[PDB]
Amino acid sequence: FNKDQLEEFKEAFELFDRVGDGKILYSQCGDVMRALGQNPTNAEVLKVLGNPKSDELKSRRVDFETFLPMLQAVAKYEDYLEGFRVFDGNGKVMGAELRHVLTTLGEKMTEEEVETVLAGHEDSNGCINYEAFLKHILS
Amino acid sequence: WXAXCPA
Amino acid sequence: ETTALVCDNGSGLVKAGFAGDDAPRAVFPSIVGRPRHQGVMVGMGQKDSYVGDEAQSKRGILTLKYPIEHGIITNWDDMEKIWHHTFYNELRVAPEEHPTLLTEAPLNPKANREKMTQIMFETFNVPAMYVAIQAVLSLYASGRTTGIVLDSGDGVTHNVPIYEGYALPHAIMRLDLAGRDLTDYLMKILTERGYSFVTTAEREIVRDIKEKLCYVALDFENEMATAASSSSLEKSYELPDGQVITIGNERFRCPETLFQPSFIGMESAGIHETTYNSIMKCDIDIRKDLYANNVMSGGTTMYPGIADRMQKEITALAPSTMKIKIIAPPERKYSVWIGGSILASLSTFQQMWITKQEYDEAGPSIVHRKCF
Amino acid sequence: ELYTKYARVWIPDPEEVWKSAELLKDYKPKVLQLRLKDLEYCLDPLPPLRNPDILVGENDLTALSYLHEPAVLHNLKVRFIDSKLIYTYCGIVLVAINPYEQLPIYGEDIINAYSGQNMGDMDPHIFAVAEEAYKQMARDERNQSIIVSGESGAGKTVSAKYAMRYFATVSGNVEEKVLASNPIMESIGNAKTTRNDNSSRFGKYIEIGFDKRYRIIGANMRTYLLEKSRVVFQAEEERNYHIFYQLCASAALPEFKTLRLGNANYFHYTKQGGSPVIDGIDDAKEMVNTRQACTLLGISDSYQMGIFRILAGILHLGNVEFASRDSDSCAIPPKHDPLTIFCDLMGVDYEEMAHWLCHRKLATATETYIKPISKLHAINARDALAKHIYANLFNWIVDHVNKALHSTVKQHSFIGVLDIYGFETFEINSFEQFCINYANEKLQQQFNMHVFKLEQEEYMKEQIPWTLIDFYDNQPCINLIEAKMGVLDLLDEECKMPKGSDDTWAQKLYNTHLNKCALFEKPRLSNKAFIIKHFADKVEYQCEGFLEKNKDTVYEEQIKVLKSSKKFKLLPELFQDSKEHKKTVGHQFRNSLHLLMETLNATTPHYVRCIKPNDFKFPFTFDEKRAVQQLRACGVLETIRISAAGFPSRWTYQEFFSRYRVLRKQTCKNVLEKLILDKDKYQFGKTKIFFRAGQVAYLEKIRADKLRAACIRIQKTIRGWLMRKKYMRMRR
Ligand SMILES: Nc1ncnc2c1ncn2[C@@H]1O[C@H](COP(=O)(O)OP(=O)(O)O)[C@@H](O)[C@H]1O
Ligand SMILES: Nc1ncnc2c1ncn2[C@@H]1O[C@H](COP(=O)(O)OP(=O)(O)O)[C@@H](O)[C@H]1O
Ligand SMILES: [Mg+2]
Ligand SMILES: [Mg+2]
């Protein structure tokens, strides 16, 4: 990251600073990394965080300067397509099945998260065109 | 038999 | 399925039947008759020889020879008839198709065993054969594992001790007094009352007298004096022509010769003293178990009184503290065949038979090694 | 190998044959780490491995991906306790466990649902086998037989009762008559034993017959393998057959009094057991059921009193006593009152019986002889006569009963339904159990040869070489028991041998077999006893009983004496229709078993197995040691093991490909060749893919790993853009 990038990222980070000390929590680190355009797995986020324990995740504090190497470490379509094609072969996915797998497999989400992400992407049958959903979620 | 008796 | 024959060649009878039967199916005298007279009529029947009860039907016209004398087969070509008659006429059964068991005296010359075996395979092609000591089979019939067997048939008298199923082959006695030689003495003294019985067919008339009327003296000098004193013993017999003949002290006097072979001119002592002298050869520990288990066997022991005479006289030899016991079922004439029927049925016995293939490989010596 | 942390394994427990463990750490090649709380556990000079839970409880126990005794015990435990589904399949064999509560399940709606529908299609219930039998009988004329085997009280009779109700409802008065027969048969042929009351001692066979259109004509009954020996002898706290107790407890009723009976503890055949009364059965009432069944089924009342007269005869016989008068000569005392009663009841002269009981006759073609006989032979003969009378009475009652069931129109074909005691163990074992486990050997031989045939045929339905199949050959033990110089043959020989005793018999056994056969063995702490390696188990038999139980011989004179009776028509009628008089119990049992097996071998079988979940009776609740014992006695566990070798999995290409494509015939074989390196683990059929044990579980493993990787990719992408939208909210 160059100085301009570091400035935009620092400004964004400070928007996530809820205490005024120029720092975020470890548990916010993943949210900030994803908010800045990265798409890390939860495992990758914890690894760059050092697989923190609950206690340090909730109370150990890091400033932007310490967060930055972690974001860098995190930073370093056809796979995305095949991953969605697992659950397809007419280009659709049941809404009930997608809801179940998204809330019970992988990096399980909440029903509210799934309702939020699925809004506008399902048709009248409750099927999602996954190439379009993927383009949307990659933007 | 063959000796001591007739059979 | 398939059931062994059991055949017992006495001197005076053949007993035959199937194993597992309760009693023999055919019995007839082991006698062969030939005609001795000029043929008068064409269209008369022709037969070269009559066997058993046929020869006893026509004995008046025949000469009667026994092939067996003192348990030895004295000529073979007659005996091979007696067996031919037995299997084909009496039992009506193929000898090629059944195991067969044959029964013999304990000491007789061992060629007799060799030829008796030889004929079964070589003439009859019997599948399987065995030979067994009569005094053994008398125990199987009596239902015992330990005893001394006294056996007297038509032609041979013998003793064998057997203790808990072991025989004592050093301990074994044989006498050549038998029912035949009682009959030959019975003729010779019957002559003294002036009845004369000369010829071979006529001898069986005497044999019927011996079977029907003899009995054994309990005390010989007292019964002799009682017969001298009165008619009270005296009893009389019809003859096939209708003559009646009347017999006194004599009718007991023949059974006495079994106990005093001096009468016939034998050296050896009576069946009592030979029985005791057999017991003496056994180890002293055995002897109490023999003294109870005296088994009578064979037809010559059928005379009334013989059990009581045996007990009373062997008692006087034995040490007084023993108990003497004498075991005489009225079966006993059969018992050697009954015992052989019991033996032939056992599954353990099936593992020993002289088999045709083994005979062919070994030759007729095989009997002496395998059989006993 | 596969093991991980939070894999699971079974380990033994002293009060539960297997218990669950979670694997806590995973290892490559001597101690395992388990949680239960927590224990370490040794490897020894590997544990059971456990099905992924979606599979567990599936209707057919060979659907399971891992097959073993813990899995099959678990599946039966959950299916019975949780779901109340008693009926369960292994292979073709149905397995049934008495629920011991009534259920909806038998209703007519279920009958109609099962009818016409295939074996896989429906869940198991006995109607599913019965309908399979019926449809096979239609598919070609060959007779179908149905075989139900299990320990005493397990539910065989009731299982057959419903199996008949199926035919009477679908095809179909036959049902009423057959169901009304049972209180007669159970009365004459069932007995009470220390393992339980109301144990059937005989094998019972029902044929149901049909016309050319498979409407239902009528029924025939046969019986086999009667335990004659129970009549004269009883082990501690056993009983002789029920009807004797029913009669004795009835003895006060104004019908019976002429029979002059005593109390039930007075008769030597009742007295030996030391157990007059069964808990909670008032047998005096209980016979009134049997008499109702007789009257409905058409035994005239004039015959019925004759039956009780004969059984009273037998009991009065057993109480006859012999003096002994010299070592070789039994005698009957100057007057003996119960013999007088016996003669009053059956009308034969007192003195003719006193003579012929005491003495034996021996007759050649030319002369007749009469022998005294010892008190031992007197007793052996008396008891053999009692057994012969009982067995003829029984077979005459059976011959009457099947009259009413027969129909005049001739059947086109029949379905044969069989109720027979299963393989057995008792904590003393005796000639009765030796017979029962021999018959069970013969049955399971047929069972194996049929299952082998079925799988041979199922293979060449498709291209796969037969050669892979093998089966359990139990023929050497049958040859041990049955064939000449075998345990039964040496027992009948020592019966003949002039002094015979269980010491001298044991000595014969040892000399013949002790190291000549792998399946016969001696317990090293007793001469009296010998071990046989049956297909299930090694059982120790005591010779102490055998000879006295083994021996029958009926003196023909006593038969003649009974045959001469004019007092009532039944007694001569029984005897109508020798060498059989000589035959021992062991030989009569062998011959009867051969007749049974020639009846069965003619027909195509189908099988049920019925297993008793607890020793002492609680509704609907399950022990596990007993259930394992029972499943070993059925041989099911051996069938499982041998199925676990070979190819216990099938899948259709259609069900397989759609799920496995996550990764046409050659494309699916290319998928498999990618997913599994080794061809030996699978085989191809025309319609199905075969796999060895648990390879489908490994395929599930790699599938789930794919599905987690893909879902993690999706969830990562979602989190990334959604958190960008969270930051755009934070700006906004
Ligand atoms: N009731 C009888 N009393 C005395 N002797 C008899 C009687 N019946 C047959 N005998 C004789 O017994 C002999 C037959 O005995 P047996 O044991 O049959 O001889 P084998 O068995 O060697 O032929 C013959 O001399 C016969 O006459
Ligand atoms: N399938 C079943 N459903 C309900 N109850 C049963 C079932 N099987 C058996 N029982 C109960 O258990 C008892 C014992 O079984 P039963 O079949 O009579 O003895 P056995 O197994 O010796 O033939 C039955 O009388 C009945 O009370
Ligand atoms: Mg003789
Ligand atoms: Mg029952």
PDB file of N, CA, C and O in Angstrom, chain C residues 1 20-25 27 140 143-145 330-331 334 338 345-348, chain D residues 327 360-366 369-371 484-485 489-490 493 496 498-499 582:
ATOM      1  N   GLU C   1     -31.158-101.587   5.397  1.00  0.00           N
ATOM      2  CA  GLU C   1     -30.017-101.288   4.543  1.00  0.00           C
ATOM      3  C   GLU C   1     -29.319-102.589   4.160  1.00  0.00           C
ATOM      4  O   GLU C   1     -29.787-103.319   3.287  1.00  0.00           O
ATOM      5  N   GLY C  20     -29.246-108.740  14.401  1.00  0.00           N
ATOM      6  CA  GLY C  20     -30.341-107.952  14.919  1.00  0.00           C
ATOM      7  C   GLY C  20     -31.630-108.700  15.170  1.00  0.00           C
ATOM      8  O   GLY C  20     -32.469-108.213  15.937  1.00  0.00           O
ATOM      9  N   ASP C  21     -31.826-109.861  14.550  1.00  0.00           N
ATOM     10  CA  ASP C  21     -32.948-110.717  14.898  1.00  0.00           C
ATOM     11  C   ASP C  21     -32.871-111.178  16.349  1.00  0.00           C
ATOM     12  O   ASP C  21     -31.809-111.198  16.977  1.00  0.00           O
ATOM     13  N   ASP C  22     -34.036-111.551  16.877  1.00  0.00           N
ATOM     14  CA  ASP C  22     -34.149-111.995  18.259  1.00  0.00           C
ATOM     15  C   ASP C  22     -33.738-113.453  18.419  1.00  0.00           C
ATOM     16  O   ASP C  22     -33.298-113.856  19.501  1.00  0.00           O
ATOM     17  N   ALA C  23     -33.874-114.247  17.362  1.00  0.00           N
ATOM     18  CA  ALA C  23     -33.610-115.678  17.403  1.00  0.00           C
ATOM     19  C   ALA C  23     -33.259-116.136  15.995  1.00  0.00           C
ATOM     20  O   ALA C  23     -33.580-115.444  15.022  1.00  0.00           O
ATOM     21  N   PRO C  24     -32.596-117.287  15.847  1.00  0.00           N
ATOM     22  CA  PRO C  24     -32.193-117.722  14.506  1.00  0.00           C
ATOM     23  C   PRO C  24     -33.393-118.036  13.631  1.00  0.00           C
ATOM     24  O   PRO C  24     -34.415-118.542  14.097  1.00  0.00           O
ATOM     25  N   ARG C  25     -33.252-117.725  12.343  1.00  0.00           N
ATOM     26  CA  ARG C  25     -34.350-117.890  11.401  1.00  0.00           C
ATOM     27  C   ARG C  25     -34.432-119.304  10.847  1.00  0.00           C
ATOM     28  O   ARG C  25     -35.526-119.769  10.510  1.00  0.00           O
ATOM     29  N   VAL C  27     -32.880-123.356  11.635  1.00  0.00           N
ATOM     30  CA  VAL C  27     -32.081-124.348  12.340  1.00  0.00           C
ATOM     31  C   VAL C  27     -32.392-125.719  11.759  1.00  0.00           C
ATOM     32  O   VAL C  27     -33.553-126.048  11.488  1.00  0.00           O
ATOM     33  N   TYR C 140     -21.638-112.214  25.593  1.00  0.00           N
ATOM     34  CA  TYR C 140     -22.496-111.195  25.003  1.00  0.00           C
ATOM     35  C   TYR C 140     -23.959-111.580  25.157  1.00  0.00           C
ATOM     36  O   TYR C 140     -24.809-110.732  25.448  1.00  0.00           O
ATOM     37  N   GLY C 143     -25.042-111.129  28.797  1.00  0.00           N
ATOM     38  CA  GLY C 143     -25.092-109.759  29.265  1.00  0.00           C
ATOM     39  C   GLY C 143     -24.125-109.514  30.403  1.00  0.00           C
ATOM     40  O   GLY C 143     -24.495-108.946  31.435  1.00  0.00           O
ATOM     41  N   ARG C 144     -22.880-109.952  30.227  1.00  0.00           N
ATOM     42  CA  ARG C 144     -21.847-109.819  31.242  1.00  0.00           C
ATOM     43  C   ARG C 144     -20.547-109.387  30.584  1.00  0.00           C
ATOM     44  O   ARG C 144     -20.335-109.591  29.387  1.00  0.00           O
ATOM     45  N   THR C 145     -19.672-108.782  31.385  1.00  0.00           N
ATOM     46  CA  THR C 145     -18.318-108.475  30.952  1.00  0.00           C
ATOM     47  C   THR C 145     -17.265-109.362  31.594  1.00  0.00           C
ATOM     48  O   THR C 145     -16.108-109.329  31.163  1.00  0.00           O
ATOM     49  N   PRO C 330     -32.675-120.768  30.027  1.00  0.00           N
ATOM     50  CA  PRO C 330     -33.145-121.806  29.099  1.00  0.00           C
ATOM     51  C   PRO C 330     -32.905-121.439  27.649  1.00  0.00           C
ATOM     52  O   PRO C 330     -32.976-122.312  26.774  1.00  0.00           O
ATOM     53  N   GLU C 331     -32.619-120.166  27.381  1.00  0.00           N
ATOM     54  CA  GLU C 331     -32.055-119.727  26.112  1.00  0.00           C
ATOM     55  C   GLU C 331     -30.789-120.473  25.707  1.00  0.00           C
ATOM     56  O   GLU C 331     -30.522-120.626  24.510  1.00  0.00           O
ATOM     57  N   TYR C 334     -29.379-121.549  22.360  1.00  0.00           N
ATOM     58  CA  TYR C 334     -29.279-120.484  21.365  1.00  0.00           C
ATOM     59  C   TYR C 334     -28.123-119.528  21.629  1.00  0.00           C
ATOM     60  O   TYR C 334     -27.721-118.780  20.725  1.00  0.00           O
ATOM     61  N   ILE C 338     -27.213-115.980  19.698  1.00  0.00           N
ATOM     62  CA  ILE C 338     -27.736-114.687  20.141  1.00  0.00           C
ATOM     63  C   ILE C 338     -26.587-113.716  20.382  1.00  0.00           C
ATOM     64  O   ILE C 338     -26.631-112.553  19.964  1.00  0.00           O
ATOM     65  N   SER C 345     -23.937-106.546  15.268  1.00  0.00           N
ATOM     66  CA  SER C 345     -24.666-105.303  15.050  1.00  0.00           C
ATOM     67  C   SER C 345     -23.915-104.061  15.516  1.00  0.00           C
ATOM     68  O   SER C 345     -24.280-102.953  15.112  1.00  0.00           O
ATOM     69  N   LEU C 346     -22.891-104.207  16.354  1.00  0.00           N
ATOM     70  CA  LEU C 346     -22.252-103.042  16.953  1.00  0.00           C
ATOM     71  C   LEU C 346     -21.466-102.231  15.930  1.00  0.00           C
ATOM     72  O   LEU C 346     -20.870-102.776  14.997  1.00  0.00           O
ATOM     73  N   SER C 347     -21.483-100.909  16.114  1.00  0.00           N
ATOM     74  CA  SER C 347     -20.794-100.003  15.201  1.00  0.00           C
ATOM     75  C   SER C 347     -19.280-100.130  15.329  1.00  0.00           C
ATOM     76  O   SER C 347     -18.557-100.042  14.330  1.00  0.00           O
ATOM     77  N   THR C 348     -18.784-100.321  16.554  1.00  0.00           N
ATOM     78  CA  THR C 348     -17.356-100.544  16.759  1.00  0.00           C
ATOM     79  C   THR C 348     -16.862-101.772  16.009  1.00  0.00           C
ATOM     80  O   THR C 348     -15.728-101.784  15.521  1.00  0.00           O
TER      81      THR C 348
ATOM     82  N   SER D 327     -31.384-111.855  42.251  1.00  0.00           N
ATOM     83  CA  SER D 327     -30.540-110.888  41.552  1.00  0.00           C
ATOM     84  C   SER D 327     -31.005-110.652  40.119  1.00  0.00           C
ATOM     85  O   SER D 327     -30.875-109.538  39.599  1.00  0.00           O
ATOM     86  N   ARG D 360     -40.107-111.552  29.953  1.00  0.00           N
ATOM     87  CA  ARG D 360     -39.853-111.380  28.532  1.00  0.00           C
ATOM     88  C   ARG D 360     -40.070-112.716  27.834  1.00  0.00           C
ATOM     89  O   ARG D 360     -39.796-113.777  28.403  1.00  0.00           O
ATOM     90  N   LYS D 361     -40.552-112.666  26.596  1.00  0.00           N
ATOM     91  CA  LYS D 361     -40.669-113.852  25.761  1.00  0.00           C
ATOM     92  C   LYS D 361     -39.663-113.845  24.620  1.00  0.00           C
ATOM     93  O   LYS D 361     -39.436-112.817  23.978  1.00  0.00           O
ATOM     94  N   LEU D 362     -39.073-115.013  24.378  1.00  0.00           N
ATOM     95  CA  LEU D 362     -38.106-115.235  23.312  1.00  0.00           C
ATOM     96  C   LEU D 362     -38.571-116.464  22.552  1.00  0.00           C
ATOM     97  O   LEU D 362     -38.750-117.528  23.151  1.00  0.00           O
ATOM     98  N   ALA D 363     -38.758-116.335  21.241  1.00  0.00           N
ATOM     99  CA  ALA D 363     -39.313-117.434  20.460  1.00  0.00           C
ATOM    100  C   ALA D 363     -38.576-117.569  19.141  1.00  0.00           C
ATOM    101  O   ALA D 363     -38.488-116.607  18.372  1.00  0.00           O
ATOM    102  N   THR D 364     -38.055-118.765  18.881  1.00  0.00           N
ATOM    103  CA  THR D 364     -37.520-119.100  17.573  1.00  0.00           C
ATOM    104  C   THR D 364     -38.660-119.547  16.659  1.00  0.00           C
ATOM    105  O   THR D 364     -39.829-119.580  17.051  1.00  0.00           O
ATOM    106  N   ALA D 365     -38.316-119.881  15.416  1.00  0.00           N
ATOM    107  CA  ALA D 365     -39.286-120.496  14.513  1.00  0.00           C
ATOM    108  C   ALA D 365     -39.874-121.786  15.075  1.00  0.00           C
ATOM    109  O   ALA D 365     -41.009-122.144  14.737  1.00  0.00           O
ATOM    110  N   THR D 366     -39.137-122.495  15.931  1.00  0.00           N
ATOM    111  CA  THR D 366     -39.496-123.855  16.307  1.00  0.00           C
ATOM    112  C   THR D 366     -39.927-124.016  17.758  1.00  0.00           C
ATOM    113  O   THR D 366     -40.486-125.061  18.104  1.00  0.00           O
ATOM    114  N   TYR D 369     -39.697-119.498  24.362  1.00  0.00           N
ATOM    115  CA  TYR D 369     -39.042-119.428  25.658  1.00  0.00           C
ATOM    116  C   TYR D 369     -39.507-118.172  26.375  1.00  0.00           C
ATOM    117  O   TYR D 369     -39.792-117.151  25.745  1.00  0.00           O
ATOM    118  N   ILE D 370     -39.584-118.250  27.698  1.00  0.00           N
ATOM    119  CA  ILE D 370     -39.956-117.104  28.514  1.00  0.00           C
ATOM    120  C   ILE D 370     -38.890-116.925  29.582  1.00  0.00           C
ATOM    121  O   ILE D 370     -38.556-117.873  30.301  1.00  0.00           O
ATOM    122  N   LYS D 371     -38.361-115.707  29.680  1.00  0.00           N
ATOM    123  CA  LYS D 371     -37.293-115.283  30.564  1.00  0.00           C
ATOM    124  C   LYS D 371     -37.815-114.388  31.676  1.00  0.00           C
ATOM    125  O   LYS D 371     -38.703-113.562  31.438  1.00  0.00           O
ATOM    126  N   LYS D 484     -21.819 -92.504  11.123  1.00  0.00           N
ATOM    127  CA  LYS D 484     -21.394 -93.696  11.847  1.00  0.00           C
ATOM    128  C   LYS D 484     -20.073 -93.464  12.570  1.00  0.00           C
ATOM    129  O   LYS D 484     -19.203 -92.731  12.092  1.00  0.00           O
ATOM    130  N   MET D 485     -19.939 -94.091  13.741  1.00  0.00           N
ATOM    131  CA  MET D 485     -18.933 -93.727  14.738  1.00  0.00           C
ATOM    132  C   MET D 485     -19.059 -92.252  15.102  1.00  0.00           C
ATOM    133  O   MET D 485     -18.086 -91.494  15.126  1.00  0.00           O
ATOM    134  N   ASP D 489     -24.477 -92.553  17.347  1.00  0.00           N
ATOM    135  CA  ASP D 489     -24.246 -93.952  17.008  1.00  0.00           C
ATOM    136  C   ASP D 489     -23.562 -94.726  18.131  1.00  0.00           C
ATOM    137  O   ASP D 489     -23.956 -95.857  18.439  1.00  0.00           O
ATOM    138  N   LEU D 490     -22.551 -94.135  18.774  1.00  0.00           N
ATOM    139  CA  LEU D 490     -21.940 -94.795  19.926  1.00  0.00           C
ATOM    140  C   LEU D 490     -22.854 -94.859  21.140  1.00  0.00           C
ATOM    141  O   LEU D 490     -22.718 -95.783  21.951  1.00  0.00           O
ATOM    142  N   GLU D 493     -25.024 -97.807  20.324  1.00  0.00           N
ATOM    143  CA  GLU D 493     -24.211 -99.003  20.495  1.00  0.00           C
ATOM    144  C   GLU D 493     -24.077 -99.373  21.965  1.00  0.00           C
ATOM    145  O   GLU D 493     -24.259-100.539  22.332  1.00  0.00           O
ATOM    146  N   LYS D 496     -26.791-101.342  23.472  1.00  0.00           N
ATOM    147  CA  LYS D 496     -26.715-102.780  23.229  1.00  0.00           C
ATOM    148  C   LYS D 496     -25.637-103.460  24.072  1.00  0.00           C
ATOM    149  O   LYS D 496     -25.851-104.568  24.576  1.00  0.00           O
ATOM    150  N   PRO D 498     -23.151-105.078  26.712  1.00  0.00           N
ATOM    151  CA  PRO D 498     -23.825-105.823  27.789  1.00  0.00           C
ATOM    152  C   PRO D 498     -23.703-105.211  29.173  1.00  0.00           C
ATOM    153  O   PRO D 498     -24.562-105.484  30.019  1.00  0.00           O
ATOM    154  N   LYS D 499     -22.687-104.396  29.442  1.00  0.00           N
ATOM    155  CA  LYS D 499     -22.797-103.384  30.482  1.00  0.00           C
ATOM    156  C   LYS D 499     -22.386-102.030  29.933  1.00  0.00           C
ATOM    157  O   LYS D 499     -21.290-101.878  29.385  1.00  0.00           O
ATOM    158  N   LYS D 582     -37.822-101.801  18.289  1.00  0.00           N
ATOM    159  CA  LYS D 582     -36.435-101.795  18.740  1.00  0.00           C
ATOM    160  C   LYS D 582     -35.820-100.401  18.758  1.00  0.00           C
ATOM    161  O   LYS D 582     -34.965-100.126  19.605  1.00  0.00           O
TER     162      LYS D 582
END
